[PDB]
Structure formats: structure tokens, C-alpha cells
Amino acid sequence: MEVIELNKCTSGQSFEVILKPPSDPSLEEIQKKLEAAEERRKYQEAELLKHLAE
Amino acid sequence: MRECISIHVGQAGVQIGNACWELYCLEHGIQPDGQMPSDKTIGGGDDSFNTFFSETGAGKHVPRAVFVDLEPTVIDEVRTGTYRQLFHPEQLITGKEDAANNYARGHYTIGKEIIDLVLDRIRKLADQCTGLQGFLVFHSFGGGTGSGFTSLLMERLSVDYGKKSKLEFSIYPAPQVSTAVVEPYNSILTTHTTLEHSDCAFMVDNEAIYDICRRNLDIERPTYTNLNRLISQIVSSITASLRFDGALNVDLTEFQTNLVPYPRIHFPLATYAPVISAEKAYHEQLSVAEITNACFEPANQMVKCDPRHGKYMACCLLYRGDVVPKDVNAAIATIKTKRSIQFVDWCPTGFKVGINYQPPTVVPGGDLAKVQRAVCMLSNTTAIAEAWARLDHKFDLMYAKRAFVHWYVGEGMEEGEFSEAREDMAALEKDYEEVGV
Amino acid sequence: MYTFVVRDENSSVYAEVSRLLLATGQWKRLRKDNPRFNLMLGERNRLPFGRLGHEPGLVQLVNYYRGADKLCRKASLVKLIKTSPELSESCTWFPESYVIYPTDEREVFLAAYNRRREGREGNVWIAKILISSEASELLDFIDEQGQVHVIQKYLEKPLLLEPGHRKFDIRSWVLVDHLYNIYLYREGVLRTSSEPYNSANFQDKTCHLTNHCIQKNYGRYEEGNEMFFEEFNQYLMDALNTTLENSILLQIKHIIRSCLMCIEPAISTKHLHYQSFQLFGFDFMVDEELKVWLIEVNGAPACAQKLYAELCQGIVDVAISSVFPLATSIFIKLHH
Amino acid sequence: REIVHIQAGQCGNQIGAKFWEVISDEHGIDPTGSYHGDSDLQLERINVYYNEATGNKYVPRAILVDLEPGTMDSVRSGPFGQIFRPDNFVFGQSGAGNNWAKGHYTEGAELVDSVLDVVRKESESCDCLQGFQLTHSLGGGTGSGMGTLLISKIREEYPDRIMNTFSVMPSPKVSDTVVEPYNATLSVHQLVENTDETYCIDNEALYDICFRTLKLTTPTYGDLNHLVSATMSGVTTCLRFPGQLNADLRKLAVNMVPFPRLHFFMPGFAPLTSRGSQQYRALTVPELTQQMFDSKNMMAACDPRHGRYLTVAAIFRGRMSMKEVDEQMLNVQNKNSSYFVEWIPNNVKTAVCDIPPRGLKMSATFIGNSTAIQELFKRISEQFTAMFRRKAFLHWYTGEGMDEMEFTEAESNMNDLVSEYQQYQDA
Ligand SMILES: Nc1nc2c(ncn2[C@@H]2O[C@H](COP(=O)(O)OP(=O)(O)OP(=O)(O)O)[C@@H](O)[C@H]2O)c(=O)[nH]1
Ligand SMILES: Nc1ncnc2c1ncn2[C@@H]1O[C@H](COP(=O)(O)OP(=O)(O)CP(=O)(O)O)[C@@H](O)[C@H]1O
Ligand SMILES: Nc1nc2c(ncn2[C@@H]2O[C@H](COP(=O)(O)OP(=O)(O)O)[C@@H](O)[C@H]2O)c(=O)[nH]1
Ligand SMILES: [Ca+2]
Ligand SMILES: [Mg+2]
Ligand SMILES: [Mg+2]
Ligand SMILES: [Mg+2]
């Protein structure tokens, strides 16, 4: 019913119609998580090469 | 004027990006070589289209966009594509081997090797900006790169651009064109890690796009090209307010303001109409009332769900073509008495409307017919949570047996991150329910 | 070969349906967590409607309408009728009722309650259980149990069956298929009282409440305190010179259709990716002037032992086999 | 993404040569190494298996291995014998006498370093090596013993690469010696630990198919290898031609292997055909789908109804209705959903390739990870135990330095593998 904030221009127009009223981690922490995960990969690869060495 | 940078990650992101930037060019009258005859401010300017294009002294208009994929196959087709001259090399970043449908491999292993390079290539674009608003990120949920590398990028952007807004365009996994069984894992994982770093995210379920193409375009077995040309039309409707003169959604911050009252619940549902086949010999053009009414048909939504059994927090109507406010208000009044539209008590029951007189552009040779008026509705309804429910159920079935988990643990990810991600999703589903019932 | 799943074991109605389906040799039952089903006989609580209709290559159907609980919950039925224009707020076939919360429209109820007092009208009401003529006798009871109840005007002048001078209520079974056709089962049942109706003392609730549960003078006049339509019709003809159709059933058909058409746009699965049907149990009440009143709607009704075979077979024919065809009718179509 | 191919022993080289023969024809490569095809689809991913040489000549990235020169001399004089890089012929003179120990510990240990020098030379030419595929039998000495030795040493030097194998299982119906169950059990132990993907090619199944279905009264190894080469072509189609699904060895592994040890696949194929016997009638898509799933078409003598599918990869080849394919693929799953584990949603994936194989207008190749595969290992274990309980024929092995304990461990690990497969069949 109530049309408001009507704005017009050559390209078009915009408006709002109401029907009814109402009723971060740091750079440090990121690299640490990425490098910690890289070590877990290194440990796993080492255990394998150890196993293969046996 | 404030600039926007578009980031395209993984196959899905890149190929959707190509569809969109192709469409953008046709809408602004930019040619494949980057020349824009209508632009009379040679070598620069601060027009509304400059939000997405920078300019060179030679009069070339280049996308403020970076393409990134951990495998060269897809971006190589950009480098040699019809719009090869549009972009320049440092915008197109490729690795050697991909993430193999593995989030952990995309985030931790291979992601660590290329994150610094990508940020540097992004920083170069940001340096050419007088007022950077933020970023539009295109990616899949299911891919290893789209999921894994994206979340890492979004984390760093929040550090390197803390004040800037970040919007997502995300492809939700659909078995009909899926390429991996573990895509539910990747989806939950990338959502959990990206959630606090995203201000607004537009989800597109490939299932919905697939069936629209089959049902309305009479394409028996849609290709990615079919899906993407349809998606770009939606994306174009959403971003048109950033690239054209107007007073609705003029910057990124306004997307959050108008569509996202609660930060975590930042996944608006998109509904688009009309989708008409080009090969359709005889077509009766649809009215403002008919296309507006179609916005409340589930068969036209980007995510199949039932908004009748949820609550609205916000609702925007974005028209393109022959449309005036009078016909819209008449349409809304009629629809309101016929359909079930419940807003949350702490929100006004209303609609923000935007009209652009330019009717939607269609790619020559495409599947879409030209129309005299089209509309895209952006509604923040709790009903979209049905998609989180489907996804988490599949996640629970596989994780109960720890199936495929060893692929992730073998890349340096802890098993605990699976359950941390899943509990974050459990909280998200509960949020939607508190608000919605 | 169609497939289905069972997620409500306590359902006597659909226990019989799953039986019949298997006995066709064209339906195969799967495990409860198998997603590759055609038909879902779902649970009563938190039925995952959101996971339906997302299986490529499968037409899916469920035996419940999402959103139909607004009709089948007492607090909701009152709110629905009062707020819906199609049922106004001056709806003539629903007893005056109010939504009351433990410590809402309590003040509004008193603006009705005391209105009767000063106006010298009947003042017996019912809490949903406590039949009383004093308000605070009721308001004290609802706050004592725990959660929300409904206060409703008690029909002090019910139709009374002779022999016995007894009270009764009518149960009608209604099936709504996927096309939102409204089918009324031709066989209904009168769940009667056996101890004569006592107008003065309300607290002994054996003659006031006609639930098949409570009264088990049982089996005196009727086998099971259940009078079917052929007998009730014959009684109406002999004792009142009218029929069941004219005096009662027209009102029943009218009330059923009005209720379900009010909520059609909110629950219809016409253009949905999955489909719904559902069996309802409408409970009606007849006063001495042969005026039918709606009491409630049951979303998960049980049937009567005689009628299980016929009704359950009926469900397969028009609700299931209509969607999934295989290699005179017992329903009345309430047209619209 | 280059793949390095290795073929070891008599069987390994005989199917390996047949494999290069078949796919060379599909990629339009003649025995000279010259391309003579009419479609560009043929060359788009030909780098996966072929190295590019002078005069635009294509040379297989293949390494031929044996402890005797007999079979490899037959390869070099065979049809496509000249296409292979002569330096990649690495052979001893002593043979392995169908003895795992000789291949793994003595005779083969003497030769293995020479082989790894060639592997290394090939690997450094690769822009991005994705991994290795080995062809061999498990019933002999070289392919079984030295092949698994090679695998172990390749994993040591390339621990982040995918190891894939085509492993021919022994069968009494097609048997060279009594000690094949010994050789096979020792090999399976190695494979469980050191490969990501193993195609179980059962000589029992290959025999039965030839006899029961193809009506070949007395099948030869040549007949058996018709089926193997047809299967090998199909399971590598997604790697050799452009596509989005299972295009590299790692993505296949991630989609097919929910648990690291359970990576032994049942290959299937349709239509089944004998050599020379010309087929005139092209199968409909429903027919291809039904047959490729039937036990009679499985290359591993296991009843898939005795187990459950963890994962499935299917590849249809030829000109056909991709809509009909998806319909039929969905029908199989929806009609027999019990034989697919419910705790891996959407575990069946399908690819389609326009190029059919030679002689057929269309075909379907099946790759199943079923728990029913345990029947294969149980069968080997029973034959193993029958002899081992009496320590029969063990002197052939103790004579090369092996101890009885090593047999006991191998036996125990294969029985563990069996029980693991059984664990998920009742989940
Ligand atoms: N709509 C649409 N979806 C796509 C497209 N390409 C891939 N997808 C979807 O994305 C998911 C797979 O993610 P991809 O983007 O292909 O993989 P990626 O991002 O490259 O990650 P990796 O390949 O594992 O390194 C699947 O669900 C696909 O259906 C596309 O062009 N359009
Ligand atoms: N307003 C009213 N006036 C007179 N009698 C009433 C009444 N409301 C209910 N009754 C009587 O009380 C009984 C209570 O049944 P209600 O349907 O209210 O609860 P229920 O849901 O536990 C029984 P069912 O589900 O089997 O119908 C009715 O069958 C009817 O006989
Ligand atoms: N399918 C097939 N199997 C073979 C062939 N040659 C040998 N075998 C099988 O492999 C086992 C013998 O191993 P073999 O390859 O001859 O031993 P190796 O030369 O020392 O590696 C037995 O189980 C045979 O049935 C062949 O050409 N084709
Ligand atoms: Ca300019
Ligand atoms: Mg990719
Ligand atoms: Mg009840
Ligand atoms: Mg031999």
C-alpha cells in the first residue's frame, strides 16, 4: 500500500513498498594451522619411509 | 564510484565467471578486444560500469577479475578463448595438479603453495582502485579447489582487507552432474571455515538449474554451458545495481543491510522468471503480475525448497525491462491475498523494488529467448535451510563409518575438524529453526 | 516394481496399507533409512519433508501434508478459524473458543464469560480436561498442568439417542490425495455414550466424554459403543422423520470442505517436487436442533475394526495407485 | 598428467603388449608410432600414456620387465613390438621358476635397480607424473614376486604418487603350478599395503566366461587375453579421453576407495564377445546396463549378490542417448538398492565417451568395489591352507632364505582383509 523512497533516473527507478509494520583469526593463527598440518604430513611420510626401511 | 573485484575459483567458478563476464560485455556494449565505443572518457572515468571494469590509455576495458585454478586445463581455455584479449596474464593463475575433489588437499597441501601468489595478484588489482568495496567470489562447494582453496582465500582476505565486504556465489552439489562422492564433506567443511568471513552468499543448487533447463528450455541433458548461461543471467540480475545507475543495492554493504539482518543467516534465496526457450516458435509475453507471481513458485527457485513453511526476513524484487511501479504494486497486492508470505515479527512485511528499463540481454545463439520483462527475487527465507538439512544428512551417513576420511587425514587435516564443522552446521540449522518456527 | 518405507510402526491404518501393498507383488518394502523410495509412510513428529523430492529418477509421495498440523492442533485450529477470512471469526459451526496460556486472549474470554453471567445464559465450558460452569475453576486447572490449553463453550443441549438418553460424537474419515481432491469415506461411526447424559453434575465425565478409551455399560446397545450409519440413519427416520444425509451429513460435508479449502494454498503440493496425501479424522457434534458442530481434526487417525479393510484398500486405490499405477467407489468427492 | 606403465613377467608382458596394441589402435597410432586418425579426440590426452618423439612419433611410456628373455622376445617380434622404446626392455636370464621368493628376494633383487633406473628416466620427462600402473600375475614368480618388490621400491622413491595395478589372480581351472596360491597370498599382502587401486582379474572368471558364455570348448591364454584387453581399455577410457569424471588416477581413487585397504575392484564388461566372432546386432542401452551388472560379465569370480557395492564406476562408449543411460543407471540402483550401501549416498558414478572400441558400436565397462570380492581372497586362502597345514612345497621358498613365519603373516593379513570386507557387508 504505502510506497516510499521512490527514486527515478533515466536507467530506471527504485522504491520500497510496505504492507505491514513489524510486531576473526590473525595471519599468525592461520599460518600456524597450515604449518601444523604440514608437519602431520611429514610425520606420516616419515613413518612410511621408516616402515619401508625395515 | 567504488570498485568491485571478482574472484573465480576452481572449474565451476571459472566457467561461471566466463559466462558472466561474457554477458556483462554484451550488456555494456564491450567487445572481445575490450573496446567500448560508447565510453567517451578515454583512458579512465568513474561511471557505474567502472565498478567492474578498469580502463587503459589505449581504450581497453578490462574486468577487475582474477581467475584461479589448481589445474591449468580450464583457465587455459580462457587464455585462448574468444575473450583472451579481455584479460591479461597475471589475472589468470594456474597450478599443476588439482585438489582431486579433496578439501584438505585444496586448503592445506596445495593451497599453502599458491595462496601468497594469488593474494599478490589480487593486491595488484586493489592498488588500481580508488575505493575498493570488496569482493565477489565464485566457486563450487563440491570441488577440492572450489571448497578448499576458497575458504583459505576468504580467511586471508579478512586479514588483508578487514574493512571490505565479501560476497559469495556458490554452487551446491547435485548428483545429476556430480563428479565426486565426497562432495557433501567438502561442502560442510568450506561452509564452516568460510561462514564468519562471508557477508552474503547466493547458493545455486545445480539440481534446480538442471530441472529448469529440462522443464523450461526443453534441453534433455543440460551441459555446464546450458547451466552456466542461465546462472549468469541470475548473477547479472543481482549485480546490475552495481554496474548501472540506480538507488537500490548500489554498494556491497547494502546487500547485507537489505538482505541479511542476522549475520550467520546470510544465504538469500534467488528466484528468477521468466525462463523461455529460444527455439520456442510461439510465445505470449508474460505480464508484470505473471512473472512476479512466478517468483513464489518453487520450480523457479535456485534452490528447491518451500518458503510457505518458513519465515521471511527480507525480500527484494529486481526487474529488467518494461516495468513501472504501478503494475508492481498491483501485482504484490494480488499475490499477497493468494499466497502464504509470513515475515518474522521483528521485520516489516514489505518489498524493496528495483527496476531497470533495459530488458535482459541474451547471448546470441544461446538457449534463452528475448523477453520484454524479467524479474529476480532475492528473499531471505528460513526455508533455504532445507538444503543444509539434506547436505548434513548425507554427511552424517558417510562420517558415521568414517568413509573416505583417510583421504583428508592424509593431507594433514585432523579428524576433529570434521566434527567441528558438523557441529557448526548443527548450530546453523538450529538458528534457522528458532527464527523460522 | 514400486518401493516404500515405513517410519511409523504404531500406525494401525498404514500397517494395514503396507500389508496390502506387499500383497500386490508390485511393491517392495525397504529399510527405514533407505532414500531410494517411491512412497513414504512417515513418522508423526519431525517428518523430514525437506529431504523429499530430491532423488533423481524417483517420483516420491508421502502420506502427510506439511503444514496440516495447523488444522489438527487444538490451539492452532482456533487461531486458524479466527484469523482466516474464509472462516471469518463469526463461523457458525464452530463453538466459541479462546486460546489461553498458563502464567493469549484471556481478557477476551472473560469479556465473553461474564457477558453470559450478567445476561443469564448457559455458562458450561470445556478445557482442553475439565467441564465447569465457573471460570476460575478452569483457569486454575490449566495453570496447574503445564502447557497451553483451549477453552471452549460446552454444547449443553446435545442430541440424545433413545434408548438410553445418551450422548455421542461422529467421526468422519477424509482422504485428501495429491491433486487435493477431497474424498469423504461413506462409512462413518458414532462413538456413543452408554450411561445416560446427566445435565446437572458435570464432573463424572463418563457420560460427557464419548472417547472409545474412557468407557472401557459398554456393549449394551451397540457392539463396541459404535453405531454405524445404517443404524443411525434408521433411528433418525423412525424417531425424527428425517435422514442422516439431510439432517447432518450436508453440514458435515460443508464443514470438511471449508476447513481444507481454507488451508489449500498453504499445504498443496500441486507444483512441488514431492507430493503429499493424508487421511484425516473429523470429529463432529450434533445438538438437539440437529445442528452440526466441529470439535476437532485428527492428523493421525485410527479406524474402526469393521472398516479397516475397506478404508485401507480405499487409500491404496485413489491416493497411492493413482500416482503409481499397477499392471463403485467408497468415497464421496466433495467437489469444488 | 602422465602415467608410467610397467609390465612384469610372462602374463604381465603378454596382456601388457595386448593392452598397448588395443589402445594404440583407438588413439590412431600404428606400429611405426605414427598417427593416422580422423578425430582430434584421439590426441587430446594421448600424453597420458605416450611420449612425443621426433617426426611427431608417439612412443609408449612403458617399461617391460622379466627375469627371462623368452616372452619379451615374443613381444619385440609381435605386431606392435617395434613401438616400444628399446632401452625400456629390462630383463634377466635366470627366470623365477614360478617362485615368489626368487622374484622378491634373490633373482629379482639383482635386477630391480636396473628397472628403477628406467622408471626414473621416464619420470623426469613427465611434466606432472600422476602415477604408475602395473600389469602382472600373482601366481608366478617374476610378476608376483619381483612386481611387488618394484611396487615397494617405487613407493619409497615416489610416496606421493598413485600406484595402480592390473593383477591376474590364479585359478586351478587355468593353472601352471601347485604353488600359485602361495605366490598369490604373499602378493596380496604386498598389494593391500602398497597400491591405491587394484583391478582383480580372475583367471577363473575369464575361463568360465569363455566356456559357459562364449561357448569356447577349450580356451587358451590368447582367448583369456581378449577379455583382459577389452576390460583394460574400458577402465582406462576416462584417463585416455577428455571427460570430467575419474579423469586422473587420484580422483578415481578418492571416488572408489572409502577405506585404504579396501581398494580391490571387480571389473565387468558388455557385450561379452569371443575373438573373430563378428557381432552384427548393437545392444540397446537397457541391455548394456543389465549385462554389465550380471555376474556372468564380471572379470572376478565373485557373486555380487553375496555382497554390497561400496562404490561403482561405469563408462558407456559409443553413440547413444545419454538420457537413456542415466535413466537405466538410475533404474538399476532403484530396483536393487539393497545391494548398494546406504551409508555412501550416490555411490554410483557414470561417464560416457563418444569413441567406441574396435568392432563394437557400443559397450559398457564396469568397475565395482564390492564386499563380495572377499570370495576371491577366501578361495585363495583355502587353497593356501590346504598345502600350508602340511608345509607342502615350502622347500622351494625356504631354499631362497624365506622363513615359515612370513607365510603365516601373509595368511593372517589376507584373512584380516576378508573380515574387513565382511564388516561392511553387515553395516
Ligand atoms: N553449475 C556448474 N557447476 C559446475 C561446473 N563445473 C563443475 N561444477 C560442479 O562443481 C562440483 C565439482 O567442483 P569443481 O569446480 O569441478 O572442482 P574444482 O573446483 O576444480 O576442485 P578440484 O578439481 O578437485 O581441484 C560438482 O558438483 C560439479 O557439478 C560448471 O561449469 N557449472
Ligand atoms: N464443546 C463441547 N461441548 C460438548 N461436548 C464436548 C465439547 N468438546 C468436547 N466434547 C466431548 O468431549 C470429548 C473429548 O474429545 P477431544 O476430541 O476434545 O479430545 P481427544 O483429542 O483426546 C479425543 P479424539 O482424538 O478421539 O476425538 C468429545 O468426543 C466430545 O464427546
Ligand atoms: N590371463 C593370463 N594369465 C597368465 C598368462 N600367462 C600366465 N598366466 C597366469 O599367471 C600365473 C603364472 O605366472 P607367470 O606370469 O607365467 O609367472 P612369471 O613369468 O614368473 O611372472 C598362472 O596363474 C597363469 O595362469 C597369460 O598370458 N594370460
Ligand atoms: Ca571511461
Ligand atoms: Mg578441477
Ligand atoms: Mg485428538
Ligand atoms: Mg609362466
Is B206 within a domain? yes
Which grid coordinates belong to C267?
499445504
Which residues, judged by CB distance below 6 Å to any ligand atom, belong to the binding site of ligand 3? Answer: D 9-11, 14-15, 96, 98, 137, 139-143, 168, 170, 174, 176, 180, 203, 221, 224-225, 228
Report the atom number in ligand 3 closest to the C-alpha of D98. 20
Beta-bridge mates of residue B203: B170
* Packing angle of the helix pair B183-194, B385-399 (nearest 10 deg): 120
D180: left (phi over 0), alpha (psi -120 to 50) or beta: alpha
Q: What is the CATH number of the domain that holds B17?
A: 3.40.50.1440
Tell me which method was used to determine the 3D structure.
Answer: X-ray
Give B365-370 contacts, CB < 8 A, sequence gap 24+: B366/B229, B366/B278, B367/B213, B367/B217, B367/B219, B367/B226, B367/B229, B367/B230, B367/B277, B367/B278, B367/B279, B368/B217, B368/B229, B368/B230, B368/B233, B368/B275, B368/B276, B368/B277, B368/B278, B369/B276, B369/B277, B369/B278, B369/B280, B369/B283
Contact C56 D334 (CB under 8 A): no
DSSP string, B196-263: GG-SEEEEEEHHHHHHHHHHHS--SS--HHHHHHHHHHHHHHHHHHHHSS-SSS-SHHHHHHHH-SSS
The stretches of chain C forming alpha helices (DSSP H) are: 12-22, 69-72, 74-83, 106-119, 135-145, 229-240, 244, 250-262, 264-267, 308-315
DSSP string, C199-245: SS--S-TTTT---TTTT--TTSSSTTSEEEHHHHHHHHHHHHS--HI
Q: How far apart are the first and last CA of chain D?
A: 37
Confirm if D231 and D201 have CB atoms less than 8 A apart.
Answer: yes
The H-or-E segment that residue D58 falls in is strand D57-60
Q: Which of residues 16-55 of C touch D (CB under 8 A)?
A: 30-31, 33-36
**Domain check: are B16 and B64 in the same one?**
yes
**Is ligand 2 within 6 A of the CB of residue C332?**
no
User: Domain D376-426 belongs to what topology?
Assistant: Helix Hairpins (1.10.287)
- Distances B333 to B131, B329, B356, C249, D13 between C-alpha atoms, Å: 40, 6, 21, 38, 78
Same CATH topology for D268-375 and D376-426: the answer is no
Q: How far is C59 from chain D (nearest CA, A)?
A: 11
* Domains in chain C: ranges and CATH: 2-62 (3.40.50.11480), 68-72+159-334 (3.30.470.20)
- Resolution in A for the shown PDB structure? 2.4
Which grid coordinates belong to B348?
516489516
Q: Which residue of D has its CA nearest to B182?
A: D255
**Domain check: are B250 and B278 in the same one?**
no
Which grid coordinates belong to C121?
445464559
D11 CA → ligand 3 middle, Å? 4
Give the three-state DSSP class for C30: coil
Confirm if C300 and C44 have CB atoms less than 8 A apart.
Answer: yes
Which among C251, C244, C241 has a CA at the least distance from the CA of C292?
A: C251
Contact B390 C49 (CB under 8 A): no
Q: Give me the half-sphere count of Cα atoms (radius 13 Å) on the Cβ side of residue C26.
A: 8
Which among B378, B7, B22 has a CA at the least distance from the CA of B204?
A: B378
**Domain check: are B132 and B49 in the same one?**
yes
Please name the residue that has the C-alpha cell 460452569: C133
Which among D351, D363, D352 has a CA at the least distance from the CA of D284?
A: D363
**Domain check: are B335 and B398 in the same one?**
no
Which ligand is the nearest neighbour of the Cα of B180? Answer: 1
Phi, psi dihedrals of residue B399, rounded to the nearest 5°:
-75, -20
Range of the domain at B315: 269-387
Phi, psi dihedrals of residue B382, rounded to the nearest 5°:
-70, -10
C188: left (phi over 0), alpha (psi -120 to 50) or beta: beta
Is B264 within a domain? no
Which among B308, B73, D318, B325 has a CA at the least distance from the CA of C267?
A: B308
**Domain check: are B278 and B222 in the same one?**
no
Other CB atoms within a 10 A radius of the CB of residue C268 amount to 17
Please name the residue that has the C-alpha cell 478409551: C213
Confirm if D120 and D157 have CB atoms less than 8 A apart.
Answer: yes
Residues D275, D267: Cα–Cα separation, whole Å: 19
Cα-to-chain-centroid distance, residue C215: 20
Other CB atoms within a 10 A radius of the CB of residue D165 amount to 28
Beta-bridge mates of residue B92: B67
User: Any idea what DSSP says for residue D341?
Assistant: -
Which grid coordinates belong to D315?
563408462
The H-or-E segment that residue B8 falls in is strand B3-9
B144 is in an annotated binding site: yes
Residues B63, B34: Cα–Cα separation, whole Å: 9
Which among B172, B156, B108 has a CA at the least distance from the CA of B7?
A: B156
Residues D202, D217: Cα–Cα separation, whole Å: 19
Burial of C120: CB neighbours in 10 Å, binned 0-12, 13-18, 19+:
exposed
Residues D411, D427: Cα–Cα separation, whole Å: 25
Which among B165, B203, B210, B208 has a CA at the least distance from the CA of B187?
A: B203
Confirm if C156 and C124 have CB atoms less than 8 A apart.
Answer: yes
Other CB atoms within a 10 A radius of the CB of residue C293 amount to 20
Residue environment code for B245-279, b if the CB has 16+ CB neighbours within 10 A, otherwise e: ebbbbbbbbbbbebbbbeeebbbbbbbbbbbbeee
DSSP string, D283-313: PPHHHHHHHHHSGGGBSSS--GGGS-EEEEE
**Breakpoints of chain B, after residues (C–N > 2.5 Å):** none
Confirm if D137 and D61 have CB atoms less than 8 A apart.
Answer: no
- Distances B6 to B11, B66, B73, B363 between C-alpha atoms, Å: 15, 6, 20, 21
DSSP string, D344-380: STT-EEEEEES-PPTT-SEEEEEEEEEGGGHHHHHHH
Give the three-state DSSP class for D59: strand
- N residues, chain D: 427
Beta-bridge mates of residue B377: B271, B317
**Domain check: are B99 and B214 in the same one?**
yes
Verify whether residue B254 is a known catalytic residue: yes
The H-or-E segment that residue D132 falls in is strand D129-137
DSSP string, C157-180: SB--BTTTTB-EEEEEEEEE-TT-
Residues D157, C138: Cα–Cα separation, whole Å: 84
Which residue owns the Cα nearest ligand 3 atom 6? D11
The H-or-E segment that residue B170 falls in is strand B165-172
The stretches of B80-165 forming alpha helices (DSSP H) are: 103-104, 115-126, 144, 150-160
Confirm if C207 and C164 have CB atoms less than 8 A apart.
Answer: no
B139 CA → ligand 1 middle, Å? 8
The H-or-E segment that residue A18 falls in is strand A12-20
Phi, psi dihedrals of residue B144, rounded to the nearest 5°:
-70, -40
Which grid coordinates belong to B119?
593474494
**Domain check: are B378 and B431 in the same one?**
no
Confirm if D376 and D300 have CB atoms less than 8 A apart.
Answer: yes
CATH class of D2-267: alpha beta
Give the three-state DSSP class for D91: strand
**Domain check: are B427 and B298 in the same one?**
no
Confirm if D17 and D161 have CB atoms less than 8 A apart.
Answer: no
Q: What is the dihedral of CA C224, C229, C230, C233, to 10 degrees?
A: 120
CATH class of D268-375: alpha beta
User: Any idea what DSSP says for residue C249?
Assistant: I
Which grid coordinates belong to C277?
496425501
Confirm if D169 and D139 have CB atoms less than 8 A apart.
Answer: yes
Residues C205, C207: Cα–Cα separation, whole Å: 6
Which ligand is the nearest neighbour of the Cα of B15? Answer: 1
The full set of domain ranges for chain D reads 2-267, 268-375, 376-426
Query: C295 CB contacts (<8 Å, ≥6 apart)?
Result: C95, C169, C283, C284, C285
Burial of B282: CB neighbours in 10 Å, binned 0-12, 13-18, 19+:
exposed
Is B320 within a domain? yes
Residues B158, B317: Cα–Cα separation, whole Å: 30
**Domain check: are B207 and B293 in the same one?**
no
Confirm if B275 and B313 have CB atoms less than 8 A apart.
Answer: no
Residues B120, B115: Cα–Cα separation, whole Å: 9
Confirm if B235 and B169 have CB atoms less than 8 A apart.
Answer: yes
D98 CA → ligand 3 middle, Å? 9
Dmax (CA) for chain A in angstroms is 82
Phi, psi dihedrals of residue D243, rounded to the nearest 5°:
180, 170
- N residues, chain B: 437
Which among D311, D222, D318, D313 has a CA at the least distance from the CA of D275?
A: D222
DSSP string, B27-65: HHT--TTSB-TT--STT----SGGGTEEE-TT-BEEESE
Mutate-to-test residue for ligand 2 from C155, C174, C209, C282, highest number of ligand atoms within 8 A of CB: C209
Residues C132, D313: Cα–Cα separation, whole Å: 71
Query: D156 CB contacts (<8 Å, ≥6 apart)?
Result: A49, A52
Confirm if C186 and C114 have CB atoms less than 8 A apart.
Answer: no
Q: How many domains are there within chain B?
A: 3
Q: List chain D residues with CB under 8 Å of C30.
A: 337-338
Residues C296, C279: Cα–Cα separation, whole Å: 14
Query: D222 CB contacts (<8 Å, ≥6 apart)?
Result: D275
Cα-to-chain-centroid distance, residue B263: 18
Confirm if B226 and B367 have CB atoms less than 8 A apart.
Answer: yes
Domain boundary among B206, B232, B259: B259
CB nearest A3 (choices: B248, B329, B356): B329
